[PDB]
Amino acid sequence: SHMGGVEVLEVRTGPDAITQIEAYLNPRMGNNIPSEDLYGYSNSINTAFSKASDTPNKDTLPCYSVAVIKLPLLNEDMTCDTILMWEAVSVKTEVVGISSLVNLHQGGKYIYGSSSGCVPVQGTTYHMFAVGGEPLELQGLVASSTATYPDDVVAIKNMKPGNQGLDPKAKALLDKDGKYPVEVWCPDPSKNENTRYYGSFTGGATTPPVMQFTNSVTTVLLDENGVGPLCKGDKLFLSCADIAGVHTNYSETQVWRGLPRYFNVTLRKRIVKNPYP
Amino acid sequence: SHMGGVEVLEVRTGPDAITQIEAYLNPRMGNNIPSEDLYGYSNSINTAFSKASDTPNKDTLPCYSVAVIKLPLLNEDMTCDTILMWEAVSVKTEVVGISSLVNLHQGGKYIYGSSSGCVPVQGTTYHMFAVGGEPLELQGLVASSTATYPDDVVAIKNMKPGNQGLDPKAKALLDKDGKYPVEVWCPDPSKNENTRYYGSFTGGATTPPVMQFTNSVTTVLLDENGVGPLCKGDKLFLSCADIAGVHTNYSETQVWRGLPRYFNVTLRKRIVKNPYP
Amino acid sequence: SHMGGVEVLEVRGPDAITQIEAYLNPRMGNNIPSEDLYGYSNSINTAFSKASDTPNKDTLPCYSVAVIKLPLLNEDMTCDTILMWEAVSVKTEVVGISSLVNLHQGGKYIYGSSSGCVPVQGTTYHMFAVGGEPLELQGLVASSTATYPDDVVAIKNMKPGNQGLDPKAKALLDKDGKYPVEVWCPDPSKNENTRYYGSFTGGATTPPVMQFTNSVTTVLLDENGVGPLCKGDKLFLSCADIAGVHTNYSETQVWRGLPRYFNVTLRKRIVKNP
Amino acid sequence: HMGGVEVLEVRTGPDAITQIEAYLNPRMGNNIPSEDLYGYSNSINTAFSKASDTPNKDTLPCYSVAVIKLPLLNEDMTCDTILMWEAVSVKTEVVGISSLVNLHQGGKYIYGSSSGCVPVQGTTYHMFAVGGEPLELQGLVASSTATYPDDVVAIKNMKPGNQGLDPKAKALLDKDGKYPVEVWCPDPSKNENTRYYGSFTGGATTPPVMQFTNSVTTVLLDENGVGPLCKGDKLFLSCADIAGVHTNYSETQVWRGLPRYFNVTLRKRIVKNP
Amino acid sequence: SHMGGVEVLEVRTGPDAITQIEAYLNPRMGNNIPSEDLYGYSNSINTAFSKASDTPNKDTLPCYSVAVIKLPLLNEDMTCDTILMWEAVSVKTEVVGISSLVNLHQGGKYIYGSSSGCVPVQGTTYHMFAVGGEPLELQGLVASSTATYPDDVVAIKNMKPGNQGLDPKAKALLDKDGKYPVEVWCPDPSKNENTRYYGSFTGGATTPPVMQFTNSVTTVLLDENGVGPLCKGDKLFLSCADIAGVHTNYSETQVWRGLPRYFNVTLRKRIVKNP
């Protein structure tokens, strides 16, 4: 016999330099208030009369979700040569409520005739998330520059046919929840140095949606220089859009269906040369 | 000539500190008793008259399966500073009966006309499993808050339109086999620190199902800190749902079809600082 | 200049290692090469009702199995140890994939009478196993009220429980072309001495997808680094390769199967005598 | 004790390394930003016959190309060695993917007149290239009897041989919006100093699939560890990104393209003088 | 300061032990000669009257392509203990002309009605290539043993229903360009020890084709014992078939469409015990 090591499991608090935050963001499909009958869906998609006359109704346009998480205060003021900042190092993220689509009794269009189940949510899907130290920077680009956007969303200013491609004047920040339409704004790849974003799109009229869920997967947020998003003003920005498809009603009107997203982000305190003038 | 080693194969007992458990869980599609004619399927899916009037018939809603496996007793009592616990380290799992779908003579809707084979099981699929040291923690989220759920399932209490998104009040434990509907409950990603879960969904009205099977794949259950699920009260929780799709009858009525899942979990004895007060 | 090595290629293997090659022809229902429809089932006859569902003989695709006798290792079976063949790897391929690339075979038309004919499509099921004893099977059916014909092995005393997993419904894959695919699947609770791999895609008319290469080897070693051990010096090769169904002009349908090739490497091992 | 601590700060990369960024707008046929259908083709007009197939002006998607002038490296060009920029890696993204998530744009209805409109779908073609000279093209067409419009670069003296690979049908991607996608592909027999990557999915009505992230870098070094070398200090960026077709209510169809962003990292290298 | 190395880039010729060859193989769908109007396509697919009466017209059957490339001569003396052989160690290969399918104006069946684009090439696809030191060895297997094959293709001798499965007598060598039908012959996995082959099939009546192209990808040809194909008689065999799908005419007649394949093969000289 001899003295030797044995590993005992116990509750461990990590070091003071590490923190984790959790949040969820509910979808902003157009009915964005929990009291609304169609919360989590858009209103019925109204289609253009013509190219020139294309005026989506209020609440028919899915928008990005964003939350700003206030992190623990690190500095007394911004006067020193170096400051402390939170660096986001990894994220675990999940789309919540996927199983809710496994439902063929909800009223709608029938799969076959009136004795069958109803058609589930299907068609175009769009799933993206971002984690950054400032708002996600957006680029405007639309299917049609002659669409008239509702007052209650943020559209491209002074739209022209050039906005059917990439016009460098069409820029915005994702700084408001449920206001920036998915069909108008995409992540700006010429910026976003301090954000990590990931997106998947599948189109088609009636395409089957595909989604995974697990609590086993972590995404590392460090860039090619080994540095994660640095949280300006001790704020963490979480952004997403999770359009599962459209639901079709018996009359063939259609509404977009979105799902919430969960985030768990790990951050560490870093010494940073002070960027604030 | 020299003395040297040769490796002889033999029946080896594992260390006393390691055990394996095997179990299977039969599906709970609605007909949940083996004596029922439609065991392994739901009853015919009855669709809503309207948003306001949507009352799924008894036994038409697939539910999660759960089994609690009692493991060998490790402690005389719970009074010491440390205790022994079983830690789940890996799982091999398989969906059983996949080949039963390779059947075009079962009565149903014809692929072409009356001389052809019948349409096989297809449409929405949902496959998930979990292995944990306590019940899987669930989040409620539904397609429609105005559905009336049957008495024999566990539904969200005081359901409101907010339940079409994520409401943090809508929480449950998967603590009853064949009682928690798939379309109401999903894993809660904000909890489940002591469970590992994995899920895959594909929707669509008539989508071909895709399934693999092999006895060559092991999934490691250790988390990011190298710790597997720790079995509270010497109990192992195995959870799953395996909806293969729907079978369509000649009359075009439709029933969900589920399949059983097999689990083989390897566990090891660990010394753990006593969690019980 | 100096003495040094150069690698010369030549024909070469040790007596402790052997390779076996085999092919298994499909057993779709027409299982004898003299049959007109060899490699296909007979026309799929569908159920009148749940209660009345009587598949005609040879309309049910079955698993293939071959038992390969390996070189005899022990003249004496009474020592502390015996020798056994351990299967360590397999190369396997579905043969005849290119035969589906045929739009002139008579059948249902893709468009009208001027177009090509619909190729084999619909449900596919591809699996293989390599083991040192019969593949162990679990019975599970779509409908317990089907009446299976007397030329196939089906579940004994079938009941509604057999639409799920009933632990009494067990069998060994020990007869070529007699165990229906739709009745039997690998039993994951056993098969410690077999490795199996399977892929299924359903749907009424789904396009089949298959690859073929001679570049891929599958290692058969389990989590303890041990391959299947061939009891009585016998190697068991099992498979099913259903490519889809062929549709005739009258809309009757037949299952189409393809052969599978195996190349298994084995090594002699010393094993403690049971 | 004295020890290290890692402080984060802005670092300017070595003088030997530079990054450039650029975007290239799609050239689907309406290639001028003032045009109503900018980012789309004009309505696809189909052949009357094999012999009479004359696509209208601006109905043919063409490749995009941009030449990026890098910092001048060499005062004297008669020296034994020279400096050149070597492209080592690229980050690239298709911009405006989310613009397709739009079911109110006027067109064909998914179901009836109460439903959303069919989104962009059908054939897709996504490719990019990063090189130190123009992308070298091979001509190959579906039909040698098509008459191409004056405003595009077609195969010279086109003959039925051009429905396969004729080594006389070669070009350089040296003009933006002039080389039709359906006439020209990358020439795999050349392009030693370019890296190209392409993905095609066909079909009449196929759902488009596209990913977007800022987390992915592609390494441009070849099997000898060498990236594209920028001749005359010019970097060539090429692409085509056809998202599918939009279908109008009258059933006329137009190609839809999307822009592509490039971020390329380059390093100065000593190169023996050609 | 000090003496040190700097890596200068220059044109380097490989060592004499290594060579690279490039080749392209044009498709052999039935119209196999460049002067033919439908070069790169089959003739219209004529369907069987019945199982017993199934007679595909000449040049309606896509066939494998093959090229035999003569490598540098290695042995003037074939009687020593050893000989030199070229060993194929890697290949870069690409399907050419993928972009030609991105064409909705070619005459044919309409996607919707007469105002829409025309249906592009779709349906069954079959893409394979092989690199070997001798002809690809083939196994015969057909959908129907009662088909009558034309005299301008090599088919199974004395065909019987057994040929709807694997009959070991049904064997051939891919030794003629454009004469061995894809629907009759597949690689023989029981042979081909001196060839590497790779193939992908997707069936279905109207399936969208999927193809990739890049010059960044190399496939290693070394087998499980670390040995690539050895080129007998200093000949390299390149084989392929690349059926992209079918084109449908307005009358609904259908033709197979094939595409060319490019090969770039790297080989090294090896000492080999003289057979």
Ligand SMILES: CC(=O)N[C@H]1[C@H]([C@H](O)[C@H](O)CO)O[C@@](O[C@@H]2[C@@H](O)[C@H](O)O[C@H](CO)[C@@H]2O)(C(=O)O)C[C@@H]1O
């Ligand atoms: C996304 C969703 O819940 N859609 C509902 C739909 C909406 O409530 C409605 O379209 C919003 O205006 O309602 C559906 O049920 C309808 C009944 O509520 C109504 O009394 O009568 C309608 C007759 O066409 C219809 O049955 C629907 O529009 O199909 C059900 C659907 O789930």
Ligand SMILES: CC(=O)N[C@H]1[C@H]([C@H](O)[C@H](O)CO)O[C@@](O[C@@H]2[C@@H](O)[C@H](O)O[C@H](CO)[C@@H]2O)(C(=O)O)C[C@@H]1O
């Ligand atoms: C999943 C399954 O077994 N479905 C059966 C189905 C059910 O047994 C039934 O719908 C539950 O009440 O029955 C099917 O066959 C039917 C006959 O049993 C009945 O005598 O007549 C029906 C006339 O439409 C029908 O043929 C069915 O509904 O198609 C067979 C099916 O596999």
Ligand SMILES: CC(=O)N[C@H]1[C@H]([C@H](O)[C@H](O)CO)O[C@@](O[C@@H]2[C@@H](O)[C@H](O)O[C@H](CO)[C@@H]2O)(C(=O)O)C[C@@H]1O
């Ligand atoms: C798999 C196969 O070869 N199928 C054949 C089919 C078979 O002979 C059998 O019927 C399948 O169960 O026969 C097909 O050809 C038929 C003629 O042989 C017969 O003279 O008349 C039929 C007219 O409806 C038909 O043309 C078929 O049923 O289409 C051809 C098919 O390839």
Ligand SMILES: CC(=O)N[C@H]1[C@H]([C@H](O)[C@H](O)CO)O[C@@](O[C@@H]2[C@@H](O)[C@H](O)O[C@H](CO)[C@@H]2O)(C(=O)O)C[C@@H]1O
């Ligand atoms: C790609 C695109 O934006 N297509 C438009 C289309 C085009 O503006 C036009 O076909 C090309 O010059 O126009 C669509 O709307 C049309 C109206 O502009 C017109 O007043 O009436 C048409 C009646 O059939 C039609 O409604 C179209 O063709 O559907 C809308 C489409 O987004």
Ligand SMILES: [Ca+2]
């Ligand atoms: Ca920038």
Ligand SMILES: [Ca+2]
């Ligand atoms: Ca939590």
Ligand SMILES: [Ca+2]
């Ligand atoms: Ca067991």
Ligand SMILES: [Ca+2]
């Ligand atoms: Ca060349």
Ligand SMILES: [Ca+2]
């Ligand atoms: Ca052999």
Ligand SMILES: [Cl-]
């Ligand atoms: Cl703007």
Ligand SMILES: [Cl-]
């Ligand atoms: Cl609740």
Ligand SMILES: [Cl-]
């Ligand atoms: Cl039994």
Ligand SMILES: [Cl-]
């Ligand atoms: Cl030319």
Ligand SMILES: [Cl-]
């Ligand atoms: Cl022969």
